[PDB]
Amino acid sequence: QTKIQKYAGTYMPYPNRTDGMTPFYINHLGRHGARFPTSRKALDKVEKVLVSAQQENGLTSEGMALLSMIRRLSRLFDGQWGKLSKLGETEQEGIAGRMIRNYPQLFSNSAKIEAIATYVPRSINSMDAFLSCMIRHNPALQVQRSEGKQYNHILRFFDLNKSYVNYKEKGDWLPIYKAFVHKKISPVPIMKKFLLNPEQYLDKEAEEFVMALFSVAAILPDTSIPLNLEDLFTLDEWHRYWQTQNLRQYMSKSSAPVGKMLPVAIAWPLLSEFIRSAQEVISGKSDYQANFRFAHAETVIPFVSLMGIEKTDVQVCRPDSVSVYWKDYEISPMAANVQWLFYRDRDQRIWVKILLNEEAAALPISTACFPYYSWEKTRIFFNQRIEMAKKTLSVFNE
């Protein structure tokens, strides 16, 4: 299932992880856990195509079965749109649990932690699943919990930059994505499963039907509903779908040349706030043992690219090559998270280890003891990235 689950892309459930080496601070950004679909539009598209085909003797047996299943999913999703699922809660409990067992001294005694979230409920509920796990392990923790639009500048910067919002909604990446879909998605073999004479559908309505169907199948494992549609498609069909969605995320939210790094540059306030909270703990201005932050794929993807974690800021000029070099499911699955772990050696020098989804990440700077980087060198590097981001944003004036 490993192959196939990756092809859900940013809908992939958080992967399976297992549990003087003690950090003095953890700096965290996490996406909410596995969630319900946010929108009924894909479901409606599939249902409309199938009902119309039923009225013209257009359905196969499996098509009729699909129609009944789509109508059932409509009922099960009602009133649940965008919510954190039971799986998403367990995902946060696992991330907190492994952090506790890996670094028990950091969160022992009366350790102080702070957590923030956006105003979106699934992110608030993810923070609370995470904090409840921490408190249950150590009720003596001191905890500050807050959330809301006051954190839009660092957690929802993708909503606040007008040039980026215009790029996201109608920028030059759209024609590239649409042409890539049209060349990658062969809908006839898929549709023949459910529809008689699929060749009499226009390419455009055929692609929309198939893409909407993939979307429904792709989000279902995140809902905790005991229903599965991954078998509607072969492994090669899932591969081709994933390639189109991977390209969509890359060009709209990351370092694609067509975006001129505007999607990445907008993340600099969060990188700046990461640096400041660490520096305040190092100086004693802050006495937190950890800062946690709960937000969205749209936060994590540009933040990771701006950090320069290797591969994630690659600027690939040929769209067909993107999937070789940049993989959304390695960056922003459900419950995606970045952790900076800070250590003091016996000479009192500060080192940092970067974890992307709980695995050590590399930076394009040197170290003689990978995966630990000099914090002084890392901070200088990150400050250069922030300055580059500000210069990029100046070309778009705002």
**One-letter amino acid of 246:** N
* d(C-alpha 215, C-alpha 99), whole Å: 32
* CATH of region 2-35+85-181+242-395, choose from 3.40.710.10, 3.40.50.300, 3.90.180.10, 3.40.50.1240: 3.40.50.1240
* d(C-alpha 126, C-alpha 121), whole Å: 8
Chain centre to alpha carbon of residue 221: 16
CA-closest candidate to residue 385, choices 273, 305, 299? 305
Q: Which three-class secondary structure state does DSSP give residue 142?
A: strand
Q: Is 55 annotated as a binding residue?
A: no
* d(C-alpha 359, C-alpha 338), whole Å: 9
User: 304 near 338, Cβ under 8 Å?
Assistant: yes
Q: What DSSP character marks residue 352?
A: E
Contacts of 175 (CB under 8 A, 6+ apart): none
* d(C-alpha 127, C-alpha 115), whole Å: 7
Q: Is 244 annotated as a binding residue?
A: no
Looking only at the bridges linking them, the beta strands covering 112-117 and 290-295 are: parallel
Distances in Å between the Cα of 286 and the Cα atoms of 106, 253, 290, 292 are 15, 33, 10, 14
Contacts of 52 (CB under 8 A, 6+ apart): 58
Looking only at the bridges linking them, the beta strands covering 350-356 and 25-31 are: unpaired
Q: Is 122 annotated as a binding residue?
A: yes
Ranges of each domain in the chain:
2-35+85-181+242-395
Q: Is 35 annotated as a binding residue?
A: yes
* d(C-alpha 154, C-alpha 266), whole Å: 10
User: 117 near 88, Cβ under 8 Å?
Assistant: no
CA-closest candidate to residue 307, choices 283, 277, 339, 333? 339
Contacts of 377 (CB under 8 A, 6+ apart): 365, 367
Q: Is 153 annotated as a binding residue?
A: no
Q: Is 329 annotated as a binding residue?
A: yes
Contacts of 317 (CB under 8 A, 6+ apart): 257
Q: What DSSP character marks residue 353?
A: E
Q: Which three-class secondary structure state does DSSP give residue 217?
A: helix
Resolution for this PDB entry, in angstroms: 2.0
* d(C-alpha 318, C-alpha 256), whole Å: 9
Q: Is 379 annotated as a binding residue?
A: no
Determine the length of the chain.
398
Other C-beta atoms closer than 10 Å to the C-beta of 256 total 26
Task: Look at the block and give the residue holding tokens 């455009």.
Answer: 204
* d(C-alpha 67, C-alpha 49), whole Å: 9
* d(C-alpha 184, C-alpha 155), whole Å: 34
Chain centre to alpha carbon of residue 226: 23
* d(C-alpha 210, C-alpha 15), whole Å: 27
Q: Is 311 annotated as a binding residue?
A: yes
Q: What DSSP character marks residue 368?
A: S
Q: Which three-class secondary structure state does DSSP give residue 102?
A: helix
SS (H, E, C) 32-95: CCCECCCCCHHHHHHHHHHHHHHCCCCECHHHHHHHHHHHHHHHHHCCCCCCECHHHHHHHHHH
Q: Is 10 annotated as a binding residue?
A: yes
Contacts of 49 (CB under 8 A, 6+ apart): 195, 205, 209
Q: Which three-class secondary structure state does DSSP give residue 351?
A: strand
User: 14 near 23, Cβ under 8 Å?
Assistant: no
Q: Is 18 annotated as a binding residue?
A: no
Query: Is 135 buried (19+), middle (13-18) or exposed (0-12) by CB count in 10 A?
Result: middle
User: 230 near 217, Cβ under 8 Å?
Assistant: yes
Phi, psi of 323 (to 5 degrees): -65, -25
CA-closest candidate to residue 298, choices 123, 79, 84? 123
User: 392 near 265, Cβ under 8 Å?
Assistant: yes
User: 148 near 154, Cβ under 8 Å?
Assistant: no
User: 84 near 335, Cβ under 8 Å?
Assistant: no
CA-closest candidate to residue 330, choices 249, 272, 224, 237? 249
Query: Is 109 buried (19+), middle (13-18) or exposed (0-12) by CB count in 10 A?
Result: exposed
Q: Is 32 annotated as a binding residue?
A: yes
